[PDB]
Design an enzyme around this catalytic site. Structure first.
Site, PDB file in Angstrom:
ATOM      1  N   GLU A   1       0.853  -1.178   0.000  1.00  0.00           N
ATOM      2  CA  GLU A   1       0.000   0.000   0.000  1.00  0.00           C
ATOM      3  C   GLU A   1       0.892   1.231   0.000  1.00  0.00           C
ATOM      4  O   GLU A   1       1.869   1.298   0.750  1.00  0.00           O
ATOM      5  CB  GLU A   1      -0.934   0.003   1.220  1.00  0.00           C
TER       6      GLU A   1
ATOM      7  N   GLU B   1      -9.050  10.042   6.039  1.00  0.00           N
ATOM      8  CA  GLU B   1      -9.181   9.084   7.140  1.00  0.00           C
ATOM      9  C   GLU B   1      -9.442   9.819   8.444  1.00  0.00           C
ATOM     10  O   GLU B   1      -8.511  10.425   9.003  1.00  0.00           O
ATOM     11  CB  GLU B   1      -7.915   8.236   7.295  1.00  0.00           C
TER      12      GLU B   1
END
Length: 218
Positions: free
Chosen positions: A116, A199
């Site tokens: 990621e 986030e």
């Protein structure tokens, strides 16, 4: 569309928007995402949230996503992207970030990967990326904190110490950096997802307004 349910989505051609409240069980709160305009040239959207509890857990990642042909990272010519965004309330614990996944299996699920890559354009409050900071690096005219961690999913996070609300770049500069200096296996990893969003950990209410996001995988 209006997207308040946990996995609500809206797509129109090249771009898709998600509410994606994958971590809501870690705390208490709610979040709604909205598509403002969408075309082949870009997408504009916003998301509004309040979250509490589970202080070091991400609650969600509402995001826009670009359609792509899955290719080996070693075969991608460029990943140009531009974004303009703003937060109305920044007294929060949250980040604003690109999220990309690669995997050796071209049919891997698209919400995780072997690797990621995150690029945090903003960090608010006392929140930190996955893993530990390994260096400070210079890529594309900006200085980034480089973080690395994770077990089955290896996550590299490039973090701007100052919010970048108007950003233009080529994500291949970041893949090239990892390939050249951290042994990233670009010739055996397929790029399977590219997203931009926020986030939240705690705080709110706060609205992220993305007035334009554009991206392409070439």
């Amino acid at each position: 569309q209006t997207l308040c349910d946990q996995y609500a989505t809206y797509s129109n051609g090249r771009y898709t928007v998600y509410n994606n409240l994958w971590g809501k069980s870690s705390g208490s709160g709610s979040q709604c995402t909205y598509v403002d305009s969408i075309s082949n040239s870009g997408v504009a959207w916003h998301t509004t949230w309040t979250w509490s509890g589970g202080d070091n857990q991400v609650k969600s990642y509402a995001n826009s996503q670009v359609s792509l042909t899955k290719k080996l990272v070693s075969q991608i010519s460029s990943i140009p992207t531009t974004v303009q965004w703003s937060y109305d309330n920044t007294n929060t614990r949250a980040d604003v970030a690109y999220d990309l996944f690669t995997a050796a299996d071209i049919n891997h699920v698209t919400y995780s990967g072997d690797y990621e890559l995150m690029i945090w354009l903003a960090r608010y409050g006392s929140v930190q990326p996955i893993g530990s900071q390994i260096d400070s690096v210079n890529i594309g005219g900006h200085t980034w904190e480089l973080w690395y961690g994770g077990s089955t999913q290896k996550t590299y996070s490039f973090v701007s110490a100052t919010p970048i609300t108007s950003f233009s770049g080529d994500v291949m500069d970041f893949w090239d950096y990892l390939t050249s200096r951290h042994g990233y296996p670009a010739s055996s990893q397929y790029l399977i997802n590219m997203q931009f969003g926020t986030e939240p950990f705690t705080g709110g209410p706060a609205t992220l307004r993305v007035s334009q996001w554009t991206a392409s995988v070439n």
